[PDB]
Structure 1
Amino acid sequence: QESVKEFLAKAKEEFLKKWESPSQNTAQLDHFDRIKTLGTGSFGRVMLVKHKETGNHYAMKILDKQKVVKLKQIEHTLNEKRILQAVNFPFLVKLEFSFKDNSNLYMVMEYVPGGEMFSHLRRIGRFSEPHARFYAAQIVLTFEYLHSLDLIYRDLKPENLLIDQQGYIQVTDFGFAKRVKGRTWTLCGTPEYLAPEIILSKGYNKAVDWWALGVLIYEMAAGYPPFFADQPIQIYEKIVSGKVRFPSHFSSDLKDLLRNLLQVDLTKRFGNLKNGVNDIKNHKWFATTDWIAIYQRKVEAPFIPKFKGPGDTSNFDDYEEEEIRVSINEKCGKEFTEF
C-alpha cells in the first residue's frame, strides 16, 4: 500500500534525525508552580504543574537519581528520554522539556485531563465491542509506527493509557521502551501482561507487544484480564499454559482474534508473521474500522470524559503530598551525564 509505505519511510527519517541529535536541559524547576500529585512509583512521581510565564499546564515526571541506580533503571531512564524527544504520532504523549538538578531527573509532558483508561473501565464495568474496538485500533496504529522505528513498548495496560479531550487514547509511561534490532533480554513489564517468552527468560522481540494487546482487548471486553491470581508465580503458570476461557457474550470474531494474539508459540502469533500488522488490520473483527479516519481523528468517540478545563484534576485520584527537595550537593552526576 504505497501511501502507507511512504508514510512510514518518512516517519523513520524524521525519527532518526532527532535520535542522533537529542536535546537536553530545556527548562528548570523554578519556571513552574506545583499544583497536585497525580501518580507515584517506586522511583518517581508525576505532578501537575503550571508554567509561570505562559500559564500552560503540564505533567512533570520527577525521578530520584539515587533510587534509579538502586532499582537498576539507569539505561531505562536514558532510553525513555531519548525515545520521547524523537517520536511524533497522534496517539503518543509529547515530551516538551527535560532537565536535571543535583537530586532528580525531570521529563515535562503535555497534561491530559481525562484520566487513565483503567478508572473509566472500572467505573463502567466493561466496554462494548465497538467501544473496545475504537481504542484497540489506536493501539494497532501506534504499534505499527513504533515497531517500524525498531522500538518495542513493553508496558501496555489500562493504567498507562489516557483518555483525551476528544475521547481518543494517548499512550504514556515509556519507562521500559527500547530501540531493538533483533532480540532483547531484560525482565520487565507487569505480571498479568507478560508474554510466555519473557517469563521463560528467552530472547524476545516485538511479538511481546502483540501478546499484550490480546490481554488488553480481553480485559476491555470482559472487565477483567484473562490470567489472574494472588501471587505472580501462579499467574505465570496460567500464562505459559495459555489455556484461556472466553465469556459467552464475546462474539465469534472476537474469540478468533484473541486466540491468534494470545498464541503461546511466538512464531505463530499475529503481528509476528510474514504479513506483519496487516494480519490484524484485515481480521474480521476490524471489518467496520476506518483506519485512515481514526488516524485523522474524524471518528466520533464512544464518550468524552467529564472535566471543567485544562487544569481540572477530578479524573485522577488523591495521593499524599510530599516535598520536592533538591540536595545542596550533586548526586550520581557521572551516571546521568547523557541525560
Structure 2
Amino acid sequence: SIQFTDGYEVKEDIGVGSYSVCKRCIHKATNMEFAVKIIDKSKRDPTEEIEILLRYGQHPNIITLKDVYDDGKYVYVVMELMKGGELLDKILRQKFFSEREASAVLFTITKTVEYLHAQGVVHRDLKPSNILYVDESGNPESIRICDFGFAKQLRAENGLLMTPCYTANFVAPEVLERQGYDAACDIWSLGVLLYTMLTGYTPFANGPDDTPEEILARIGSGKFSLSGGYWNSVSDTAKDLVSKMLHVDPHQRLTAALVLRHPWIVHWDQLPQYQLNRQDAPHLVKGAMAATYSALNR
C-alpha cells in the first residue's frame, strides 16, 4: 500500500554498492535520519539478506532494520544510520590506542559473529568497510556490522532452516563443508582486521596498486610478517592469536568460539596499555583493503 517515497525522501549516497546503492534518507514524518539500501531485483534477490536482518537485527552490534518496501522493481531497506564512521578508519587515526583497546573491539565483534554462526549464518563479506561505529562515543557497544548482502543462512535440501547444532535433517555435503569454509573465511577476515589494527598496515597488501597476482600469492603461501618493525612492542599472546586467525588452512584456523577463549581475549587486563607504534597512513590502508578483497572476489 504505502510507498517508500510516501514516507521518506532520499539524500546523498553513503556509498558501497554492488547491484545496489545506499543513500541517506529522512523519514519525512518524524524527521529522523536513516540509511536506505536500494536493491535491483533484476540483478540480485534480497530475500536471504532481508530475513537475516529481520531475525538477527535485534543484536546490538548488528545494524538495525527500521523498515522495508518493494515497488515490484526495487527493494528499499531502511536501516540505522552510522554517524561514527567506519570503525577501522577511526581506530587507525588514534595515536593513543593500545592492545587492551584492540582486544575489546575484537571481543565485541567476534561475539557478534559467534552468535551468527551458532544460528547457521555466515557473513562471507566481513571486510572492515562494513563495520562501523553508530555514534562517536567510541564505545565497543556502539560498534555495528552493517551489510549482510552476501550472508547465507544454512538450509537443508528440504528447505529447512538449520543450525550447526541440529543435524538430523539432510543437508548436502558440499553445502556443509562450504558452511565450514565460509565460517573459517569470516574468521580470516577478522584476523585481517586485527593485523591491521595492531600495526596500522594490512598483512597482504601495501597499497591500492599492488597487483592482484602478488596479493593472491602472499595469501596462498600464508606466511605474513609477525616480528620486527611495528611488531616489536606487540605482545606474544597477540601474535599467537593473529597467526591462528590467519592460519592458511581453514581447518586448523580458529573458530569464533575458540578465538573468544584465547588468552588475548579472556585475560585482556594483562594486555599492554601503552600506545601501539603503527604506520599512520589510514588512506593507504583503505586502498590496500580494497585491493586485497578485489583480488579475492574476481
1:204 counterpart residue number: 181
The answer to whether the 8 Å contact 1:121/1:127 transfers is: yes
The answer to whether the 8 Å contact 1:32/1:51 transfers is: yes
The answer to whether the 8 Å contact 2:3/2:71 transfers is: no
1:281 counterpart residue number: 260
Is 2:212 aligned against 1:235? no
The SS at the match of 1:267 is coil
Structure 2 residue runs of 5 or longer lacking an equivalent are 156-170, 270-298
Q: Deviations over 1:80-112 (max 9, x none)?
A: 112111112111011121112254221110112
2:21 counterpart residue number: 45
> In structure 1, what residue type is equivalent to 2:266?
A
Q: Deviations over 1:89-140 (max 9, x none)?
A: 1110111211122542211101121111133144337942122112100111
**Matches for 1:1-339 after TM superposition, within 5 Å:** 28-66=4-42, 68=43, 73-74=44-45, 77-87=46-56, 88-124=58-94, 127-165=97-135, 166-167=137-138, 168-180=142-154, 204-228=181-205, 230-246=210-226, 247-271=231-255, 277=257, 279-289=258-268
> In structure 2, what residue type is equivalent to 1:287?
V
Cα distance, 1:27–1:251 mapped onto 2, change above 3 Å = farther
Q: CA deviation at 1:259?
A: 1.3
Q: CA RMSD in A?
A: 2.7
Structure 1 residue runs of 5 or longer lacking an equivalent are 1-24, 186-196, 291-339
The SS at the match of 1:124 is coil
Cα distance, 1:107–1:240 mapped onto 2, change above 3 Å = same
Distance 2:146 2:2 in 1: 20
The SS at the match of 1:228 is coil
> In structure 1, what residue type is equivalent to 2:153?
R
Distance 1:160 1:139 in 2: 12
Q: CA deviation at 1:146?
A: 0.2
* TM-score in terms of structure 1 length: 0.64
Aligned length: 241
Distance 2:96 2:204 in 1: 17
Give percent identity, aligned residues only.
Answer: 35
The SS at the match of 1:80 is helix
The SS at the match of 2:55 is coil
> In structure 2, what residue type is equivalent to 1:255?
K
Distance 2:199 2:97 in 1: 8
The SS at the match of 1:90 is coil
Which structure 1 residue ranges, 4+ long, deviate > 6 Å from structure 2? Answer: 182-185
> In structure 1, what residue type is equivalent to 2:251?
T
